[model samples]
Target: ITVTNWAGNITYTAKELLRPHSLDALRALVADSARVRVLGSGHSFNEIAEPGDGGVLLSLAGLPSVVDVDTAARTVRVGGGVRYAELARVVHARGLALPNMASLPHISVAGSVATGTHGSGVGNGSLASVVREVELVTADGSTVVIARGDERFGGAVTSLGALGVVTSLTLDLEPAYEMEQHVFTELPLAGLDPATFETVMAAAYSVSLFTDWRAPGFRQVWLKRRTDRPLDGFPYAAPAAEKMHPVPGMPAVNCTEQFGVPGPWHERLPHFRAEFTPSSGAELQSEYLMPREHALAALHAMDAIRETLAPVLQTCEIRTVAADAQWLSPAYGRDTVAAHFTWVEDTAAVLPVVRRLEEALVPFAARPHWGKVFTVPAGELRALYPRLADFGALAGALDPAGKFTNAFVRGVLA
Candidate 1:
């Protein structure tokens, strides 16, 4: 059967697609295959998830949905196949919640962490940072458990599916809390200085600034604050008069509750409702992660080319991620500012813009998101990850025969 990614941008070239119902069946298939690659939730915009020629593509969605919460340990062991949308409800019911969540709850947990997906928060790290343990089925058909303190833990968490098939993950969880979401509109573009940028972003537990590039100022600023904390006044932008979506023309109904409504952490942390499609489905996405120190300068660099980006750009989101120790994580070592772009569906028109965007952010040594569309060259991209060689060595040791290697992973690692 035909298989395409969530955005319907890339069609799989694999000779076969399989969904094993049991771990034993999965291990046997992976062990017996000539070349194998796992596809999760199909949310990636690029070919990172695509299997090589004559290879087999596996989807873990058919496996059991394991949500074993250890309240005393403050962690949950989740099946690799489980989606955040489903896992969130389970943990919330048990009075536990993930520290943060990506904008779309529909993405698979293993895939999201492997690709370093993140939510908007100055204090929250990328999704991978919360991974306390990973249960992987290695190339030799053997199960390996990598825990937080393991020497290779950093390299394994965001392993890019080059190491093995992740069967399950144990992630750190926090007590469930209430959050209030408020959307502010039209923060004047000219008013965004380094100081103001810090002030606005640090105003809440999680803040996201959205712009359409064609506009004179930000289209919307979403501030999510934990109800336990005292509310701080934001004077820069006025509160939205009505509900709003991040992308300019999308329906507000697709987004989560707003207007300072207090809800559970799982309900308010993500920008979109789990039941609705996230963002404009017919779009391409790219994001650059750089040290927060260079955030304003990077914005200036992007602003200079706003006109070039206007035609194909649907919206741009700016958010922060705290530093983490995961070796391949985009937010590793330093607090990060991510600039995400949602583009019109035409790939031909989008490619050049992505290239230009890459160039603008390159001065700040930006790292592209592994799951999204990007044109950053191999050498340049490799230079952004200080631990690249270490990761390469780890992959080599764990996947000696290169059984999991694909064109995308090979290109990046080589």
Candidate 2:
């Protein structure tokens, strides 16, 4: 069977690559298979839901279509395979927009939501947090609809493709809003306390801090605010950029371009595109979502250990997002502060850093993203999730035979 993902790291080998153009086709395929797994945009960094060898792989790409839009209710229903870019175009056409969005828009709507992929916003949750309803294809080939008020709704949002294969979803949308972005450089790390960190972050509608391990302090801070602000109305301005911080005696890929070459939102966020001057090339990423209360501690812990990690880390980013109740969400019940790291292509160097970071933050109750790399044990992860037991229970009821269990799933959900 055809097998590959955007990262080109994980490969699949299924007995069949079933492309179903319609709901009925999907039902028929499921009815014929003893076990099946659905593939979306394949944007996930891990293989949590990919099928194993000789299993059935259901490709949802052919099902990409907008089902309905209820402007009066500010809701949109779409096929699970719809990518963020296409979904954004559809919602924007309807004079609406998603509450938040991740850096790359190529990921599938369902896949991102199921994995709790999020965008940075002070009081905003992950993309799945806006889901009002989800229509899933159950193991028995029957359809089950879970809505916002349903008791099982929370568990269904970030189902990890375990409960069932989601066919369609209805997401609450906001009236379109314009945003203005600003990029600042050379923020000193000396004497920066946790209190100061919180105060500065609170000033922006959205914020991102970038740091190369070799630097003694932050290299840049990108800030974004509502377009209606006075600063947004002024002509575009570029902050003085800083030089790359080189790690002593270690090979590192320069990621200055990933930070952007000082520009507007349209140009800055997707800096990895070929047309951009400064951008991060093919790389791997790992992020941890910790409670806001523990945010400062986590940051301090990382910084305290930064020198030990300098050789492997390309850059470390700090961002925030609001709380959400999606069952498997990283920001499950508390406002989350995300600490992300983009590493050089070498997994050997990166994995050790990730493990050490995870160990350092474990006491803070860090929740790893389902799509990213982490070395936390399954039992430990199950304890970190407030609704882990409930989610596992629900999956057991819905997928009684464990039809969706893959190597990744088994490792995380054991």
TM per prediction? 0.98, 0.87
lDDT of 2 by residue, 92-146 (tens): 7778777777766666788899888887767777889889999998888899999
State how far residue 77 of model 1 sits from its true place (Å): 0.7
Give a tens-digit lDDT track for model 1, residues 1-414.
788888898999965679999989999999998888899888899999888678889989788899999989888999998999999999999999888999989889999988889998899999998888999999888999999889999999898998899999998898999999999999887968889999998999999999988767788999999999987799999999999999888889988999898999999988888788543279889999999999989888877899998899989999999997988888888999999998999999999989998878878989999999999999888888999899999999999988888989899888
Which one wins on lDDT? 1
Clashing pairs in 1: none
Q: Which candidate tops TM-score?
A: 1
lDDT of each: 0.90, 0.73
Per-candidate clashes come to 0, 2
Candidate no. 1 TM-score: 0.98
Worst 10 residues of 1 by lDDT: 272-281
